[PDB]
Amino acid sequence: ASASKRAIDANQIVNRMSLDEKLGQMLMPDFRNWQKEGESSPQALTKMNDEVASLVKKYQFGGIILFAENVKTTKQTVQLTDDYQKASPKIPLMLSIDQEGGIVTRLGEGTNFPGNMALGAARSRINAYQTGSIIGKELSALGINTDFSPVVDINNNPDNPVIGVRSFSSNRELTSRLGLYTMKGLQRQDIASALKHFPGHGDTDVDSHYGLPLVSHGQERLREVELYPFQKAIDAGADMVMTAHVQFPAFDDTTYKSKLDGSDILVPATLSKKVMTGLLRQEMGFNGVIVTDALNMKAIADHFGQEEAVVMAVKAGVDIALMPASVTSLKEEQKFARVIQALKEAVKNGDIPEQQINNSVERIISLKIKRGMYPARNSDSTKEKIAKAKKIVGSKQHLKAEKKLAEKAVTVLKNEQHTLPFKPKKGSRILIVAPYEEQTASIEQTIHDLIKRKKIKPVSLSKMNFASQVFKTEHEKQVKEADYIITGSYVVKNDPVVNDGVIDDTISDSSKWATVFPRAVMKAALQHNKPFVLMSLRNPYDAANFEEAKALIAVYGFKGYANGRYLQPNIPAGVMAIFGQAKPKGTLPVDIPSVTKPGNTLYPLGYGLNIKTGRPL
Numbered sequence: 001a002s003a004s005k006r007a008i009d010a011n012q013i014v015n016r017m018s019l020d021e022k023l024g025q026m027l028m029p030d031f032r033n034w035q036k037e038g039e040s041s042p043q044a045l046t047k048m049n050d051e052v053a054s055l056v057k058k059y060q061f062g063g064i065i066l067f068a069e070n071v072k073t074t075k076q077t078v079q080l081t082d083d084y085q086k087a088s089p090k091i092p093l094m095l096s097i098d099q100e101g102g103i104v105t106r107l108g109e110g111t112n113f114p115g116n117m118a119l120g121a122a123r124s125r126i127n128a129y130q131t132g133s134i135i136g137k138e139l140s141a142l143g144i145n146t147d148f149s150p151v152v153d154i155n156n157n158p159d160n161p162v163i164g165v166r167s168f169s170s171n172r173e174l175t176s177r178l179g180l181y182t183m184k185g186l187q188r189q190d191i192a193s194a195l196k197h198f199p200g201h202g203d204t205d206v207d208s209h210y211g212l213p214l215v216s217h218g219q220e221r222l223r224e225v226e227l228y229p230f231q232k233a234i235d236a237g238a239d240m241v242m243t244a245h246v247q248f249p250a251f252d253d254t255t256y257k258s259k260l261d262g263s264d265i266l267v268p269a270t271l272s273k274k275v276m277t278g279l280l281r282q283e284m285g286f287n288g289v290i291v292t293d294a295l296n297m298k299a300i301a302d303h304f305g306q307e308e309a310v311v312m313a314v315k316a317g318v319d320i321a322l323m324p325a326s327v328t329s330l331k332e333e334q335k336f337a338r339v340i341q342a343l344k345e346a347v348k349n350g351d352i353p354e355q356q357i358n359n360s361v362e363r364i365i366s367l368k369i370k371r372g373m374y375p376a377r378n379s380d381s382t383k384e385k386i387a388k389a390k391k392i393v394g395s396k397q398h399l400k401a402e403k404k405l406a407e408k409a410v411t412v413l414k415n416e417q418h419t420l421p422f423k424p425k426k427g428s429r430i431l432i433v434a435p436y437e438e439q440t441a442s443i444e445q446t447i448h449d450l451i452k453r454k455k456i457k458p459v460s461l462s463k464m465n466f467a468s469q470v471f472k473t474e475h476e477k478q479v480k481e482a483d484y485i486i487t488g489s490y491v492v493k494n495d496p497v498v499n500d501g502v503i504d505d506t507i508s509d510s511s512k513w514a515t516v517f518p519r520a521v522m523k524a525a526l527q528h529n530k531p532f533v534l535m536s537l538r539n540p541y542d543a544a545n546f547e548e549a550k551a552l553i554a555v556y557g558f559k560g561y562a563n564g565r566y567l568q569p570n571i572p573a574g575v576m577a578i579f580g581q582a583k584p585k586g587t588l589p590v591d592i593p594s595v596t597k598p599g600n601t602l603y604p605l606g607y608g609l610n611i612k613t614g615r616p617l
């Protein structure tokens with residue numbers, strides 16, 4: 001009824017459009033940085049200028065994707081989005097963002113949240129809904145109306161360099177569940193939500209930012225695992241699906257000549273009709289907006305021309321070509337005209353039926369209608385909008401929420417003989433060991449705060465940043481003088497040197513600092529009977545690098561503290577747990593493969609301890 005009227009409205013609006021305006025809607029560029037007339041190279045775009053406004057009016061793009069560069073402050077963001085909607089000549093823009101929460105956030109002053117895998121660790125599907133709801137509220141106040149979230153890739157390859165903690169789980173049901181509820185949470189605030197990255201990027205060991213990944217599983221495994229959370233959310237009302245620049249020869253074994261080396265490469269799903277029309281649109285029944293992942297990524301740009309990529313995606317069935325060309329000043333603006341003209345030539349010849357363009361643009365208009373983008377609802381002043389958004393974005397209540405989720409997500413994997421919590425006597429020396437300066441700064445700040453607040457006795461603190469370092473006598477001396485030692489380990493792909501089950505602790509350089517260094521610190525604390533706790537900070541699989549430790553947590557998020565601000569809540573939440581000020585309730589959303597005993601799991605999915613009793617939760 002409202003759905004029936006919305007489809008007729010989109011049809012009428014599109015029937016009244018020129019081919020140029022229709023192709024424009026199908027493009028979503030970024031203007032992350034810009035080099036205005038007179039400037040010497042592209043700077044962060046935080047305020048609108050009449051140059052960028054002129055390409056929006058010229059080309060009538062359907063929307064713009066914002067990056068951190070564009071959204072550093074709430075004040076500046078409300079003004080940019082008002083200003084953008086001001087430049088769009090006929091139809092309100094989709095203003096989109098990667099506010100995933102956790103390790104992928106953009107909003108300068110917003111609530112960052114622990115991230116998907118921390119949500120998986122917390123289990124409860126209402127927390128994913130509350131995250132999607134709070135993000136949705138913050139984006140709304142800011143005038144951003146699209147979120148490229150949730151990632152519903154299933155992270156079942158622990159060597160995954162691009163997804164990892166951006167996934168809820170290695171388990172299809174947990175991911176599906178938390179994915180559906182994030183989506184509902186966003187759609188509830190009128191934010192269009194995109195599932196990504198279809199048909200499932202969770203098994204790759206290559207980053208599609210850097211080259212073209214291959215998933216070689218059959219259709220039966222692909223339907224039961226990778227597709228699963230997509231189908232559930234598509235049925236449930238998914239607004240949009242984002243594609244994956246990844247090859248699936250079980251789905252489409254069409255090859256193309258790589259612009260790079262002339263070689264035969266399997267097509268990336270983004271550019272396959274079999275996957276985007278056959279599978280997604282038809283078998284899977286998705287009639288919402290298909291959007292490319294960024295076409296600037298090397299998985300695409302290495303092997304396909306610029307115009308040629310855009311044309312091949314649309315031919316495959318996508319509605320929106322995301323980041324089709326990077327134009328950073330007025331002198332490169334013809335890149336856009338060239339994509340538009342290539343599409344026109346494709347319509348003219350009939351390689352892309354103009355009716356296909358119509359159906360695609362209708363979808364886009366209809367989403368803009370469905371989510372209240374069009375007509376533009378708000379009649380407040382920019383000044384009023386900035387006052388209001390200032391009270392909502394990064395609000396105290398929102399922080400309370402992020403604090404609670406981050407603390408619950410904390411997973412304790414070992415705590416022998418009540419090593420945790422640390423209850424330090426006054427004047428104890430606490431050694432903080434972490435890869436980077438911001439991480440040691442975060443742990444220090446949380447501790448300082450704990451002292452300030454009379455939660456713990458006064459201790460002195462010392463830092464040790466070990467990225468690219470070799471463990472030297474100066475370091476062991478610090479461990480020796482320490483009363484308590486807290487060490488953060490950081491891995492993406494876990495690749496310690498190991499020979500017949502023995503992690504090689506004889507390496508005397510710092511190529512393998514990420515595994516060899518923290519293991520060195522451990523071995524010195526254990527040799528000297530120092531209270532020692534290992535906190536895994538990114539991918540949890542490094543838990544296998546410390547079987548000797550008596551205490552060991554994972555927090556699923558690695559960003560620390562710079563410029564007076566915590567860039568994630570996960571490290572503070574683990575530090576609270578360590579000092580007794582928080583109750584971790586987390587259980588592993590993934591298996592941790594044994595390092596000493598290849599082929600065995602060390603900690604099963606769903607394993608996690610009660611920090612007080614030491615019994616599995």
Ligand SMILES: CC(=O)N[C@H]1/C(=N/OC(=O)Nc2ccccc2)O[C@H](CO)[C@@H](O)[C@@H]1O
Pocket residue numbers: 065098148162196197201208209210293294296297298
């Ligand atoms: C696999 C993945 O992380 N793709 C992301 C993504 N990947 O592309 C880039 O942002 N551009 C790029 C950065 C470094 C190297 C090559 C391309 O872009 C989309 C929009 O920004 C995100 O929504 C997608 O999640």
Ligand code: NA
Pocket residue numbers: 197201208209243244245246293299
């Ligand atoms: Na991709």
